[PDB]
Amino acid sequence: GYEVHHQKLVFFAEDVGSNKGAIIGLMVGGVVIA
Amino acid sequence: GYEVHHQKLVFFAEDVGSNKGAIIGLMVGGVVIA
Amino acid sequence: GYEVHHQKLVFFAEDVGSNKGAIIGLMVGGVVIA
Amino acid sequence: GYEVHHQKLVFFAEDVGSNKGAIIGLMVGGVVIA
Amino acid sequence: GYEVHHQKLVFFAEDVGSNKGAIIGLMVGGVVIA
Amino acid sequence: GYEVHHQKLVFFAEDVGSNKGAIIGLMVGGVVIA
Amino acid sequence: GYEVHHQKLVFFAEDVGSNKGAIIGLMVGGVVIA
Amino acid sequence: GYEVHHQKLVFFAEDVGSNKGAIIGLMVGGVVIA
Amino acid sequence: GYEVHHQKLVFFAEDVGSNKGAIIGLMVGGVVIA
Amino acid sequence: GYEVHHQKLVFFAEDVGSNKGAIIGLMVGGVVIA
Amino acid sequence: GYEVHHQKLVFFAEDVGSNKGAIIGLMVGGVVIA
Amino acid sequence: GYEVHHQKLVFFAEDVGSNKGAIIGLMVGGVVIA
Ligand SMILES: CNc1ccc(CCc2ccc(OCCOCCOCCF)nc2)cc1
Ligand SMILES: CNc1ccc(CCc2ccc(OCCOCCOCCF)nc2)cc1
């Protein structure tokens, strides 16, 4: 009697342009110097 | 008698332009120096 | 009585253009100097 | 009574153009100097 | 009573053009100087 | 009662053109100077 | 004039014994059927 | 004037014994059936 | 004026004994049936 | 003015004994049946 | 003004004894039946 | 102004004894039946 479907997970749906910095979807630990 | 569907999770729906800093969707620990 | 289907996980759905920095979908540890 | 199907995982769905930096789908450890 | 099928994992679905930097699908350790 | 089939793993589905940098599907250790 | 040190992040400090279920330190997306 | 040191991140500090289930430090996507 | 050192990341510091299940430090996608 | 050193990443610091299951340090995609 | 040194990455620091299952440091794709 | 040295990557630092299963440092694709 269990049913799971059509989940959805997005990080950056739209466009990413002319980036000159640091774009990170998921970070664990770690250092960022933008 | 259980049913789950059509969930949805977004972090940045729209556009990301000319970034010069640090954009992070999910961070655990870690240091950021923008 | 268990059934899972049609999950979906995206990091960058749209386009990525003229990047001059650091774009990272998932990072564990590690240092980034943008 | 178990069944899993039609999962899907993407890192960069759309196009990647004129890149002059560092684009990384998944990083463990390691240093990036963009 | 177990069955798994039709999984799918992609790193760069769309096109990659005129790259002049470092594009890496999965990195463990290692240094990148873009 | 176990059955697995029709998995699929891709690194660069679409085309790769006019590359002048370093495109790497999977890297363990190692240094990249793009 | 900036200095950060001696941070610390733990998920399971003590012991984990005779587990018969699902113990997960950090989960993003994904389904768990315990 | 920037200095970061002596960070530390642990997932399971203590012992793990007689496990009969699923112990996962970090999971992105994916299904677990314990 | 930047300096980073003595970071540290561990997944299972202590011992792992008599395991009869699935112990995974980091998982992306993928199914686990313990 | 940049300097990084003495990072460290471990997956299983301590001992691993009498294993009868599946111990995996890092998994991308793929199915595990313990 | 860039310098990186003395990084270190380990998968199984301590001993591995009397294994009767599947111990894998890094897996991409692929099925494991322990 | 770039210099990298004294990196280090290990898979099994300590001893491996009386193994009766499958120990694999790095696997891409492929099936394991322990
Ligand atoms: C607030 N809590 C917190 C906790 C932890 C952190 C950072 C942890 C970390 C761990 C490792 C790392 O780098 C690994 C370098 O591995 C390159 C090996 O390269 C091999 C070439 F052959 N960086 C950072 C930050 C904050
Ligand atoms: C409430 N929002 C929400 C959002 C998302 C989710 C789940 C997302 C997800 C994505 C992928 C996945 O599985 C990937 C299977 O990849 C195996 C490929 O194996 C290759 C063998 F060769 N599972 C779950 C749940 C909830």
* Backbone angles phi and psi of H23, in degrees to 5: -115, 120
CA H20 to chain centre: 17
How far is residue J11 from each of residues A24, I14, K14, measured CA to CA in Å? Answer: 23, 11, 10
**Residue E26 and residue D26 in contact, taking contact as beta carbons nearer than 8 Å:** yes
Q: Is D21 annotated as a binding residue?
A: no
Q: How far is I2 from chain E (nearest CA, A)?
A: 17
Closest alpha carbon to D22 in H5, L13, E20: E20
> Which residue's CA lies nearest to atom 5 of ligand 1?
A29
Beta bridge partners of C22: A22, D22
Amino acid occupying residue J17: G
Secondary structure percentages of chain E, helix, strand, coil, to 5: 0, 40, 60
Count of other CB atoms within 10 angstroms of residue J8:
18
Count of other CB atoms within 10 angstroms of residue K15:
16
Residue by residue, DSSP assigns chain J as: ---EE---B-SB-S-EES--SEEES-EES-EEE-
Choosing from C27, C28, C31 the residue with most ligand 1 atoms within 8 A of its CB, the one to mutate for a pocket test is: C31
Closest alpha carbon to I25 in I12, I14, I9, I8: I12
Q: Is D10 in the pocket of ligand 2 (CB under 6 A)?
A: no
Show the tokens assigned to H30: 């994916």
Beta bridge partners of L4: K4
**Residue J9 and residue K9 in contact, taking contact as beta carbons nearer than 8 Å:** yes
Closest alpha carbon to C34 in E26, B19, D28, E11: B19
Closest alpha carbon to I21 in A7, J3, J19, L13: J19
On chain C, the residues whose CB falls within 8 A of the CB of B19 are 21
Give the contacts of B31 (CB within 8 A, at least 6 positions apart).
Answer: A31, A32, G4, G7, H4, H7
Give the contacts of E15 (CB within 8 A, at least 6 positions apart).
Answer: D15, D16, D17, F14, F15, F16, F17
Break positions in chain G: residue before each gap, C to N over 2.5 angstroms: none
Cα L26 to Cα F27: distance, rounded to the nearest angstrom: 11
Show the tokens assigned to D12: 């960069």
Beta bridge partners of H4: G4, I4
Cα F12 to Cα F34: distance, rounded to the nearest angstrom: 19
What is the distance between the terminal CA atoms of chain C, rounded to a whole angstrom? 49
Residue E6 touches partner I, C-beta closer than 8 Å: no
Count of other CB atoms within 10 angstroms of residue G17:
12
- State the distance from the centre of ligand 1 to the C-alpha of A34, rounded, in angstroms: 17
Angular region, A26: left φ>0, alpha ψ -120 to 50, beta rest: beta
Q: In three state form, how does the secondary structure of chain A look?
A: CCCEECCCECCECCCEECCCCEEECCEECCEEEC
Cα L20 to Cα G3: distance, rounded to the nearest angstrom: 50
Cα C7 to Cα D8: distance, rounded to the nearest angstrom: 6
Amino acid occupying residue H24: I
On chain J, the residues whose CB falls within 8 A of the CB of I24 are 22-25, 27, 32
Q: At how many Å resolution was this determined?
A: 3.3
In this complex, do B1 and A1 lie within 8 Å of one another by their Cβ atoms? yes
Q: Which residues of J are annotated as a binding site?
A: 2, 5-6
Cα E16 to Cα F18: distance, rounded to the nearest angstrom: 9
Residue located via tokens 């005129």:
E18
How far is residue A15 from each of residues A6, B12, B20, D23, E5, measured CA to CA in Å? Answer: 23, 10, 16, 15, 32
- State the distance from the centre of ligand 1 to the C-alpha of A27, rounded, in angstroms: 11
**Residue H25 and residue H12 in contact, taking contact as beta carbons nearer than 8 Å:** yes
CA H31 to chain centre: 17
How far is residue J13 from each of residues E10, J16, K26, L11, measured CA to CA in Å? Answer: 32, 9, 16, 11
Strand order of the β-sheet with B4-5 is B4-5, A4-5, C4-5, D4-5, E4-5, F4-5
Closest alpha carbon to G31 in D31, B4, L1, C26: B4
Show the tokens assigned to L24: 């694999």
C-facing residues of H in 11-30 (CB < 8 A) are 26, 28-29
Cα C11 to Cα E26: distance, rounded to the nearest angstrom: 14
Cα K12 to Cα E9: distance, rounded to the nearest angstrom: 27
Give the contacts of A33 (CB within 8 A, at least 6 positions apart).
Answer: A22, B33, C31, C32, C33, C34, H2, I2
